[PDB]
């Protein structure tokens, strides 16, 4: 018994990037209440986020459009190496102290509320954030992808964005780590006055001068369930049997996934919901808007463990890739004339980061039948969670964690 | 502390059978749509099914009626050895090529839709199936049991069926493996034209001439939960306590079984249902129609893991015994006069199979109380799934698999 | 990255008690039906219950009131050593046979229905129970605590109860093991006539004369989840994020606890209920009546695994501390004048038990924020099951087991 | 990417007699004498021999595909002989590279047989080599599920059954 003819492919995507980060000052910014978002204090950092959790980081649009032709593709591994170089410091002073901040896994820390934000800067102090730019994390990643890979040859603004993948040039990063604390100025009743969390107790800080041209980040990740392309559709057994809608015992094991909803306001207890609305991503009644629209390139992270469910007996668990933020500590420029205990002026400093990223993906072609083409075993069918409005649900890393977890969100039509 | 007086019994049932199988041709038969069963193409084989998954295969009716008197009986193991002998070939030709097909576990393969069917044969070609006999799998097993063990002494047709258990004679087998594919002649819309699956890539084929008087099958199975007789009823604690209907925490473990319903048409997502309708098989409100009617002898397979639930903390998982089909490949009889690229005439060939089957079962008598008789600990209470109409639910091996699984079905009143 | 400042404390509470137990006769007492409690026969023993499962056994009220000031306190371990001394026997006879009964884990045996009860005794035979005192198990433990630790200095009856913790004196015990069987005198229909279970097959019996001043019990227990004081409240993330009510995938794992309801009358099948009504024991909408009223001192056992749920991914399982009953077998005083085959008169015998008990507890102070005080990570939030009427639900050891399990019950307002 | 396609076939060949057949002139084809053999041609030089239509339709999605190697193993089994005689002499003919021999003019042809002697070719069937290979492919892999004659041709790739060969040297 030779069994199935399954043709197995492994592909590797390597990219290499030059990143410049501003040495932003640590200032407190007020963010007003907006709808369900409350009023809060924002503490900015100079640690720019490295979007190693997204497919555009490793794959050019050509490689992605070719990968489309390989159903059953799963990202098996990702690896990122970050190597710092000389740090630029504005000149009139000569002696300089340069420090390199590296934050790994801040996004998953439960008690630290933090997101990556783009700041607006004062004209007089380009290192001092004075507000928040309207740019979102999706738009940050989209502009980053445009800087990496250029426009199309027919674009009216093609010349504005030379491709970093072609030139090897540097890209400035704008999303920097930002901690939040509650703003109790207008809070009525019980006020929480804990201030900020000591986030510097959870980051690594190095001597930039000694770390010039030295590896400072080396992070590897194995994906649990990262479907880049949906599997081949099986031959539907409803065309061959009246048994298609049969039931079989599951025993004491859970072989249908569940979703956990929490409430940090403690108004309601946490809830576990089984058999949430979901639908197949290949087959007769397939819904492939997630892969067609399209989402897994830069809008949604590579790792989607928990979101995608197979009819197989295989166990499913929640997943989360560690976050990476790297930056240069702000260089103070305060003196005795500008009488103050904390720096209110800083020197323009830039960190130089060389990023080498490798992504391994792997795909199958199963020949379960003689004619037509590839058909999978129906145990390979995959389902994705959906909302009530036919809108797919996916993991997001942009929002702050919920009890240390990355949440599901309804995707957005591009 | 000596503890309970538990008397523990082990019993062994051995049987030995002679089976004759026809070398049926591989022909395509059309099966028309009937109700929810769609139109399909049937590809016949010569591999007869060995019903080693049923209790009559190992136990005579006398042994079964005695086993009734031992509550708490569980089938612990089954073992089958199949030994092939000389193969008969019709004579006018002399040189012969004989091949022995052995298929193990075809029933559990997800993408191969297959069942065991009885064929009707043409008058001119007794090796060529021309249709399907109205005999079902239950009736096949019932006729097989009648051939093995005879009728009752008062039967009007007692003389027609000499007992193979007494005589050692051979029994012809009529259920042969049959693959199905969809019939898209009348299908409107999206047609699946994959043809048949290459089922011969999953079977073993031997040289019958060299395998004469040689062991070809040796399959052992350990049962997970195979209650042949319901346990002893416990002393009901509602007669002694007001606490009988109390609740206790289950934690994050599932200690009540669940049922999974799938839909191969992909019209609906798979569903997991906890607390399905079920009832106790011993005690005050017991329902024992499954064991009384009676079902576990030849109507329903021995292995019933998932169907039966104890109040105990013990974990439950889905179960499935591997299928066994053995046969002789058809011997073609085509020549140049009957101009054709594939054989349309075959020689009458028969395979001789010697089957030695052993079943180990084991039972308990617990003396939890001083007077009356045996009473179990109430943690030994067993529940069985039931349908809405008071009809027990049991595993069945007759239908094609659903995503590689054997399904529950409502039993049928005998 | 130094991480959180978490200050970790370990505390040990040791107590030492002298216990006197009556050598009660084994007599059958009739208990009439009351509401949902049926009519039953009660078989008394002389094995007094050792309440080592309650906090007052190890902690004085001063230590308990101080332990209140340490949020996040969990009982990590308990240990009990019981050492028997000389046994008193009433004098006119000289030769004596004294036997020491030790029962461990009788409470968890499924088929033995047993509770600890206080008996009323005949005037002529102080060793012969003639009924049941109206004292409950809570009131037994409360009187025991009063004997151990005295009243308050302003109590009108302060002088009546000298503290055993101060004096080292002996305390008589009144809750003795009592087996129950059904009373079928008025039962109509199917009568269960099994009599009593042979409970002496599950106890250890020693020679008291040789065991004088010898260790007879040595039992250690590690608690799974025993929150003595609720954790520190976290900083609520609804004050900082609009993400507070987000959902995240649970996969095939259960990370919300479930409750199992059984029915020993077998009128209904067992049920598993997920997302039972529960509420947080610290934070904005906290409900702390369980710890304020207060329950975990002597009303409710230390071990509460299953009752308390964290938002953490940690697995939860049902828990149960073994029971301890120690006593002296009754010394018969029957002769030929009082013609009878079983003793109807007994000598006054008392067992002397020295109990050394140690409880280890351990607590945390996490400094997740800079100002205000201690705040936990929100993954440390704890929820407790509640009833429909805002009444907390807790494990109880007073009722007979349900399928070998200790049940949840609605607590009682003190 | 590297891909491997394996197939396994059972072939029956007739022991055709060596007879001389006359082929008349047709257009530019001259009149010639044809000497038949019993050596059936093995179409190992064609892609359907190794690949099912499903594998071929998937291979379409891989531009730049080159066949790097082919390998064929032929294993003979028992030879059937008609019965009234008992003693038999059976001989197995294997011809490799006859097609490339310059002075031997040879092609693979399908014969028509006499009713009285099924081993004696009496002419040439109108079947061509393309149609021979097409019928062979149909025997190997079956028809489409919607074909009116689907039942006539059970797939040898599924069943493992034998296929008779008609093009002989």
Chain A residues whose CB is inside 8 A of the C372 CB are 192-195
Subunits touching B (CB < 8 Å, at least 3 pairs)?
A, C, D
The answer to whether the CB atoms of A269 and C383 lie below 8 A apart is yes
Tell me the pairing of strands A175-182 and A40-49.
antiparallel
The closest of A299, A312, A118, A326 to A214, measured between CA atoms, is A326
Tell me the pairing of strands B204-207 and B99-104.
antiparallel
Residue B312 to residue A117: CA distance in whole angstroms = 54
The answer to whether the CB atoms of B251 and C317 lie below 8 A apart is yes
The closest of A14, A22, A13 to A353, measured between CA atoms, is A22
Contacts of B216 (CB under 8 A, 6+ apart): B82, B83, B84, B100, B102, B206, B326
Residue C121 to residue C134: CA distance in whole angstroms = 13
| Method used to obtain the model | cryo-EM
The answer to whether the CB atoms of D3 and A7 lie below 8 A apart is yes
Q: How many CB atoms lie within 10 A of CB A372?
A: 20
The closest of C295, C291, C297, C354 to C149, measured between CA atoms, is C297
Interrupted after residues, chain D (C–N over 2.5 Å): 83
Task: Give the rounded distance of the alpha carbon of A261 from its chain centre.
Answer: 21
| Residue environment code for B85-120, b if the CB has 16+ CB neighbours within 10 A, otherwise e | eebebbeeeeebbbbbbbbbbbbbbbbbbbbbbbbe
Residue D75 to residue A124: CA distance in whole angstroms = 88
User: Measuring CA to CA, how many Å separate A382 from each of A238, A280, A341, B105, D33?
Assistant: 17, 6, 59, 25, 65
The closest of B398, B354, B300, B357 to B21, measured between CA atoms, is B354
Chain C residues whose CB is inside 8 A of the A265 CB are 236, 238, 244-245, 284-285
Cβ atoms of A273 and A385 closer than 8 Å: no
Resolution of the experimental model, in Å, one decimal = 2.7
The answer to whether the CB atoms of D54 and A7 lie below 8 A apart is no
Residue C96 to residue C330: CA distance in whole angstroms = 11
Chain D residues whose CB is inside 8 A of the B182 CB are 145
What sign for the dihedral angle of Cα B381, B384, B385, B387?
Answer: negative
Closest chain C C-alpha to A269 CA, distance in angstroms: 6
Residue A373 to residue A368: CA distance in whole angstroms = 9
Backbone angles phi, psi at A65, to 5 degrees: -65, -30
Chain B residues whose CB is inside 8 A of the A311 CB are 262, 270, 403
The answer to whether the CB atoms of A368 and B402 lie below 8 A apart is no
Contacts of B144 (CB under 8 A, 6+ apart): B51, B56, B171, B173, B298
User: Token pair of A335, please?
Assistant: 């003196």
Task: Give the rounded distance of the alpha carbon of A56 from its chain centre.
Answer: 11
User: Token pair of C349, please?
Assistant: 């015998």
Chain C residues whose CB is inside 8 A of the B317 CB are none
Backbone angles phi, psi at A310, to 5 degrees: -100, 155
Residue C265 to residue C182: CA distance in whole angstroms = 13
List the beta bridge partners of residue A393: A410
Cβ atoms of B359 and B80 closer than 8 Å: no
Contacts of B230 (CB under 8 A, 6+ apart): B71, B72, B281, B282, B286, B288, B291, B382
Backbone angles phi, psi at C66, to 5 degrees: -75, -40
List the beta bridge partners of residue A414: none
User: Token pair of B327, please?
Assistant: 């046969």
Residue B117 to residue B137: CA distance in whole angstroms = 7
Residue C406 to residue C397: CA distance in whole angstroms = 6
DSSP state of D53: H
Residue A250 to residue A258: CA distance in whole angstroms = 15
The answer to whether the CB atoms of A266 and C284 lie below 8 A apart is yes
DSSP state of A145: H
CA-nearest residue to B98 within chain D is D78
Query: Which helix (H) or strand (E) covers residue B142, if one does?
Result: helix B137-149
Task: Choose the mutation target among D5, D7, D54 for the interface with A, i.e. most A CBs under 10 Å.
Answer: D54
Contacts of A200 (CB under 8 A, 6+ apart): none
Cβ atoms of C369 and A197 closer than 8 Å: yes
For residue B287, the number of C-alpha atoms closer than 13 Å in the C-beta half-sphere is: 20
DSSP state of A232: P
Cβ atoms of B47 and B326 closer than 8 Å: yes
What sign for the dihedral angle of Cα A86, A89, A95, A96?
Answer: negative
User: Token pair of C276, please?
Assistant: 């039972």
Contacts of B321 (CB under 8 A, 6+ apart): B52, B53, B78, B221, B301, B302, B303, B397
The answer to whether the CB atoms of B182 and A239 lie below 8 A apart is yes
Cβ atoms of A284 and A371 closer than 8 Å: no
Cβ atoms of B196 and A369 closer than 8 Å: yes
Q: Where are the alpha helices (DSSP H) in D37-152?
A: 53-59, 129-141
User: Measuring CA to CA, how many Å separate C372 from each of C63, C156, C364, C367?
Assistant: 27, 43, 17, 10
Q: How many CB atoms lie within 10 A of CB D77?
A: 10
Residue A114 to residue B21: CA distance in whole angstroms = 73
Residue A384 to residue A410: CA distance in whole angstroms = 12
Backbone angles phi, psi at C280, to 5 degrees: -70, 145
Q: Is A63 helix (H, G, I), strand (E, B) or coil?
A: helix
The string of DSSP codes covering B363-400 is EEEEE-SSSSS-BB-GGG-EEEEB-TTS-BEEE-SSSP
Chain A residues whose CB is inside 8 A of the C2 CB are 201
Nearest to A111 among C235, C251, C279 (CB): C235
Cβ atoms of B219 and B80 closer than 8 Å: yes
Angle at A105 between CA A102 and CA A109, to 5 degrees: 125
Q: Is C346 helix (H, G, I), strand (E, B) or coil?
A: strand
Residue A11 to residue A15: CA distance in whole angstroms = 14
Residue B130 to residue B120: CA distance in whole angstroms = 6
Q: Is B330 helix (H, G, I), strand (E, B) or coil?
A: coil
Residue C354 to residue C86: CA distance in whole angstroms = 11
Instruction: Name residue, tokens 């370990």.
Output: C10
The closest of A50, A28, A32 to A326, measured between CA atoms, is A50
Nearest to C265 among B236, B277, B311 (CB): B236
Angle at A14 between CA A12 and CA A19, to 5 degrees: 155
Nearest to D53 among A9, A69, A371 (CB): A371
User: Token pair of B375, please?
Assistant: 């009473």
The string of DSSP codes covering B257-310 is -EEEE--TT-SS--EEEES-SEEESSSTT---HHHHTT-TTTTS-S--BTTEEE
Residue B300 to residue B290: CA distance in whole angstroms = 10
Tell me the pairing of strands A74-84 and A114-121.
unpaired
Angle at B55 between CA B54 and CA B56, to 5 degrees: 95
- Count of A-D CB contacts under 8 Å: 36
Q: Where are the alpha helices (DSSP H) in A150-248?
A: 164-167, 208-211
């Amino acid at each position: 018994p030779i069994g199935l003819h399954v043709e197995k492919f492994q592909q590797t995507y390597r990219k290499k990037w030059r990143f410049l980060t501003s040495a932003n000052a640590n200032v407190i910014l007020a963010e007003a209440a907006s709808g369900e978002r409350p009023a809060r204090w924002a503490l900015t950092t100079g640690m720019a986020s490295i979007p190693w959790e997204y497919l555009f980081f490793y794959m050019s649009p050509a490689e992605y459009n070719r990968m489309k032709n390989y159903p059953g593709t799963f990202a098996k591994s990702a690896s990122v190496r970050i190597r710092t170089w000389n740090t630029r410091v504005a000149f009139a002073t000569l002696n300089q102290n340069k420090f390199l901040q590296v934050a790994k896994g801040i996004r998953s820390i439960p008690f630290i509320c933090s997101t990556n934000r783009k700041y607006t800067y004062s004209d007089t102090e380009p290192m001092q954030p004075t507000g928040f730019a309207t740019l979102t994390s999706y738009e940050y990643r989209d502009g980053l992808k445009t800087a990496m890979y250029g426009y199309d040859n027919d674009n009216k603004d093609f010349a504005k964005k030379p491709p970093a993948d072609a030139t090897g040039a540097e890209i400035y990063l704008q999303d920097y780590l930002t901690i939040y604390t509650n703003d109790a100025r207008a809070t009525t009743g019980t006020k929480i006055l804990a201030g900020f969390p000591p986030y510097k107790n959870f980051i690594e800080e190095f001597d930039a001068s000694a770390c010039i041209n030295t590896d400072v980040v080396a992070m590897d990740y194995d994906f649990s369930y990262a479907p880049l392309v949906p599997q081949f559709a099986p031959v539907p057994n409803n065309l061959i049997t009246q048994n298609y809608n049969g039931s079989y015992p599951a025993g004491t094991k859970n072989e249908v996934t569940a979703a956990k909803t929490t409430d940090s306001s403690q108004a309601t207890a946490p809830t576990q919901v089984r058999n949430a609305p979901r639908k197949y991503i290949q087959g007769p009644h397939a819904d492939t808007t997630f892969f067609d629209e399209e989402q897994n390139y830069l809008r949604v992270p590579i790792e989607q463990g928990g979101i995608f469910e197979e009819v197989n007996v295989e166990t499913v668990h929640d997943t989360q890739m560690p976050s990476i933020n790297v930056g240069i500590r702000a260089v103070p420029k305060l003196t005795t004339i500008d009488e103050t205990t904390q720096a209110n002026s800083w020197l323009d400093a830039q960190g130089y980061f060389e990023v080498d990223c490798v992504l391994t993906t792997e795909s199958v072609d199963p020949y379960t039948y003689i004619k037509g083409g590839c058909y999978s075993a129906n145990t390979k069918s995959q389902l994705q969670y959906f909302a009530s409005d036919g809108r797919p649900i996916a993991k997001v890393y942009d929002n702050p964690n919920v009890y240390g977890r990355m949440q599901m969100i309804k995707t957005v039509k591009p």
